[PDB]
Amino acid sequence: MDYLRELYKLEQQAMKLYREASEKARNPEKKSVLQKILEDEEKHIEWLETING
Amino acid sequence: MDYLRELYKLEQQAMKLYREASEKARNPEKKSVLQKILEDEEKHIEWLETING
Numbered sequence: 001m002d003y004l005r006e007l008y009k010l011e012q013q014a015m016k017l018y019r020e021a022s023e024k025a026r027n028p029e030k031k032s033v034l035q036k037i038l039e040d041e042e043k044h045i046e047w048l049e050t051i052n053g
Numbered sequence: 054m055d056y057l058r059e060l061y062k063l064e065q066q067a068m069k070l071y072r073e074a075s076e077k078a079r080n081p082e083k084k085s086v087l088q089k090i091l092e093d094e095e096k097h098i099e100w101l102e103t104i105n106g
């Protein structure tokens with residue numbers, strides 16, 4: 001029952017946290033560790049769009 | 054600076070939702086599409102534990 005926007009929005013609230021965290025985490029150690037989670041979340045967001053209708 | 058807990062919690066609020074989404078997604082087509090998120094999305098928590106302090 002009407003449950004998929006609830007998943008996707010929390011899914012993108014992490015991606016948007018990951019943008020702002022990247023501004024603070026500008027050091028190359030963390031900037032190359034949160035980037036792999038960012039690319040994994042962009043993968044989920046692609047599939048979430050493919051599954052939306 | 055100490056934002057890592059805030060990211061992990063929103064990362065786990067999707068995961069706690071996803072724990073129940075898997076029951077409504079009992080159909081095996083869906084249960085092999087949200088499953089690849091679940092395996093990636095547990096992986097973030099796995100690295101976040103190594104990042105914690």
Ligand SMILES: [Zn+2]
Nearest residue numbers: 011041044094
């Ligand atoms: Zn995700």
Ligand SMILES: [Zn+2]
Nearest residue numbers: 014064094097
């Ligand atoms: Zn994640």
